[PDB]
Design a protein around this ligand. Structure first.
Ligand SMILES: CCCCCCCCCCCC
Ligand SMILES: CCCCCCCCCCCC
Ligand SMILES: CCCCCCCCCCCC
Ligand SMILES: CCCCCCCCCCCC
Ligand SMILES: CCCCCCCCCCCC
Ligand SMILES: CCCCCCCCCCCC
Ligand SMILES: CCCCCCCCCCCC
Ligand SMILES: [Cl-]
Ligand SMILES: [Cl-]
Ligand SMILES: [Mg+2]
Ligand SMILES: [Mg+2]
Ligand SMILES: [Mg+2]
Lengths: 346, 346, 346
């Protein structure tokens, strides 16, 4: 909701409360999943061509008791945009791989989980410096590209580590070294095609015998297709990763091949059914695991939009993984999940 | 404060800062108690009859040093309301027993503590699905009823528990199995009369030898009366509970009888003195405790309203509990407390 | 940003996102330092002479992974102001010493660090009761004074302590006993001169073998000068402390002498270069340390203001401390730092 617009500065204060419940035999996910998000998007006109902006978004869990608080920053960045030349921002933001993989990240509740957060340049993460160019300097409508750098996020400070430390250090599964990435998308009428590549130095803490998927760099190669016209939405993405896809708690996949596809239809009266399939196939994983499915599920659901501020949904995760030694070892969910949600937003 | 109202959506952003200090011989409550609350209530018009809404409220303590953060979510829910039929909402909300007991929870600082938060269906808690009918299809002015369900909130995940786990699990004093409850209130002119009932399954983690008050289910039965007119506020509530009332850290009371009464007057010049009495009498407690007072105090206080946005208050808790073995074991406060508060709100 | 002004009540919702990166050989400070702040300031007109107000300010780090949250309350207080008589507020707030020392806390990133937070009455802290008078009861334009009390903030409750506990207790380095302080400042045309004194009881937890600088009270004496006109900003402050200045993790300085001076110029086109010198010198530190430099650096930087809502800066801390056993023992940084920041604010 635009709560301020005066003297060249605008502030949008936005958010949502999602009253959400999961039903599953996996009791680690089963039960109340209520959460809220809150954010702001501000923009200031410096000149006719130059605009400044800032964006921040925060999630606060609404399913805990009052003696605990589970909350986190999703994004937090500041930037400058110059008409027909480009934009630059720095902060906690999305990796440029998500420019393409976000196209299938449209399910009512599930989806978008062949990758995670703080997972190299694949989704949300710290220390992204991002250049974006829309419509190729204004010369080619629908052609967008982006170039991105991510600074190292290493070992925790003040804990006796003698190398690889950064001020904002963390556990090895969420670390990264210096990284570079780029994306390109082209949309013409209903159709969209896109590609993205990222390459990040892996840290010394990540490359130990404690974790599968050792290697000098974490790399991803992604291609995507889209159709978004005439009340239909179709999308698919394929990603091949090296030492980049997490395998539960075990570390990373030496190689993974990830695939997501989605089909949706929007009825005039507000109902939007959705069908999706997601898989992540791990190769040469190590420790005698050889090849294993990391993720495999069909998703069927629907959202009903009352209007722009209110919706409700059902989502059914049909989990095709089987309970075996590998999934137990990695802590990967193999159970079905049904989610029921009622969402107010502003 | 309403900060947005446009095209049928409204957003109220509200909060307060309470500069607050306790004086007590009990050093665990003595000192700075400063805090703030923030919240939003949003509503969106779907049709002339149907409205969607959401509410979120958060408390952040203002009395800690900067190397820590003590904050929590009070409520977080989304809902639908249909004109002359009813409403439904889901999330963290108040239990329906509070429809009646809230009537005496009107003291400047203290009060409202014959029960607590995350305490079956008695006050705030997770996973409430709440159905409400106001004015009986608009055919009986002032008559309201509600029926409520609470889903299980069990053992924490990822801690080696082999049963009773939920995604949002917690310590046993704040757990609950599935519950159902209901409330009826009638208000004619200044007068009010009300009743409520709740029945919750108790979890296995709650029914161990480590806690007093073992039982299959927690039940509560409440009656209340109110008078609110001519600058006079009077209210009283009586509640009988079974395996539902906490006895400090010891567990729960096999049976408890709770009573609260308040008298308040509003002077034209802004002063509102308040007198209250609360007691909770436990019976058949176990471990040789037998019958014991869980709570017993007289509260005398006053609030001065400068206007609807600024006020100051003093509240004096004259604590009639005596220091004995039982209160020592349970960690129940037996000392008096004086609170002094200065409050800005919007 | 003023988001509400209606019927005598006013609310300013303000904040900023600082996309920020440090470059340093010290890996404990090196890396992404992105953060955001959010706050509100509210005021209500009670009469033509009396105004009520509240303020709250919060910082949320934007440089961490989503599995943790590093945030805190900077300030949270409520108060009343009566025209030509004075103001009183209570809560988490700034010590009156900062009335004078704030005059040199104007550097683009560094500065303000011969003292810290929760550091007796020197900067932000809990339980301050503060009286202020502007223009000496309206009789002397530009003459301001302040008198302040801070309540004890002691040992944590529930941790087995038998004396010195408060409800909001914390670690010894952030404790304080009861304190009193005052400041006076006179400002006329470009110029300013001012003084402040504070005296706090130190707690028993602070006077143990674990900490250097044992003593009965923490005392500070500060003088300061300022010129602020004709696009020029000059300021200097000198403070003499006893058992009040922290020496990294080691405890406090029996005696310290602190000095800060700054010179800035504002070019019409938006650039504001800055030069500063800071030092803190400890004497009779004990434990064989004798006299030692606690802090010593020159700061050269510049901020470029695109407008009132957008800015960017570079700040270069040239650290004149040498690495020795003392700085290593204390965890005090001796390496240079370059900070680069891009800031959106509203
Ligand atoms: C008592 C304060 C007087 C100090 C004023 C400084 C005068 C220098 C010109
Ligand atoms: C009472 C506040 C004014 C304090 C003036 C003393 C300044 C000390 C300088 C060393
Ligand atoms: C009131 C004392 C002013 C002098 C301060 C000197 C600053 C260095
Ligand atoms: C001109 C500033 C002098 C600094 C010396 C402090 C002792
Ligand atoms: C590091 C250079 C700072 C020197 C500034 C001295 C200003 C004196 C205060 C005059 C008022
Ligand atoms: C620019 C000001 C430098 C101040 C250095 C003071 C050191 C005093 C030594 C005794
Ligand atoms: C602009 C970044 C260059 C890095 C220089 C490092 C200096 C250490 C402090
Ligand atoms: Cl222009
Ligand atoms: Cl937290
Ligand atoms: Mg399965
Ligand atoms: Mg007593
Ligand atoms: Mg040095």
């Amino acid at each position: 909701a635009e709560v301020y617009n005066k003297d060249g500065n605008k502030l949008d204060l936005y958010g949502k409360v999602d009253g959400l419940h999961y039903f599953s035999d996996n009791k680690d996910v089963d039960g109340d999943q209520t959460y809220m998000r809150l954010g702001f998007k501000g923009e200031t006109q410096v000149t006719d061509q130059l605009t400044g902006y800032g964006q921040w978004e925060y999630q606060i869990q609404g399913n805990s008791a009052e003696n605990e608080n589970n909350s986190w920053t999703r994004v937090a960045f500041a930037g400058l945009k110059f008409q027909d030349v480009g934009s630059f921002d720095y902060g906690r933001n999305y990796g440029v791989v998500y420019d393409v993989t976000s196209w299938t990240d449209v399910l009512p509740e599930f989806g978008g989980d062949t990758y995670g957060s703080d997972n190299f340049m694949q989704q949300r993460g710290n220390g992204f410096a991002t250049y974006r160019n829309t419509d190729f300097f204004g010369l080619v409508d629908g052609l967008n590209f982006a170039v991105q750098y991510q600074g190292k996020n290493g070992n925790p400070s003040g804990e006796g580590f003698t190398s690889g430390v950064t001020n904002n250090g963390r556990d090895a599964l969420r670390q990264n070294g210096d990284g570079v990435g780029g994306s390109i998308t082209y949309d013409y009428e209903g159709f969209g095609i896109g590609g993205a590549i990222s390459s990040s130095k892996r840290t010394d803490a990540q490359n130990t015998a404690a974790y599968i998927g050792n290697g000098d760099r974490a790399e991803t190669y992604t291609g995507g297709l889209k159709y978004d016209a005439n009340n239909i939405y179709l999308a698919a993405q394929y990603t091949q990763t090296y030492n980049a896809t997490r395998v539960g708690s075990l570390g990373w996949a030496n190689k993974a091949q990830n695939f997501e596809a989605v089909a949706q239809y929007q009825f005039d009266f507000g109902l939007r059914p959705s069908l999706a399939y997601l898989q992540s196939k791990g190769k040469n994983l190590g420790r005698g695991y050889d090849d294993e499915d990391i993720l495999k599920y069909v998703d069927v659901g629907a959202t009903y939009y009352f209007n722009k501020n209110m919706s409700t949904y059902v989502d059914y995760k049909i989990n095709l993984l089987d309970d075996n030694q590998f999934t137990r070892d990695a802590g990967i969910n193999t159970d079905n999940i049904v989610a029921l949600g009622l969402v107010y937003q502003f």
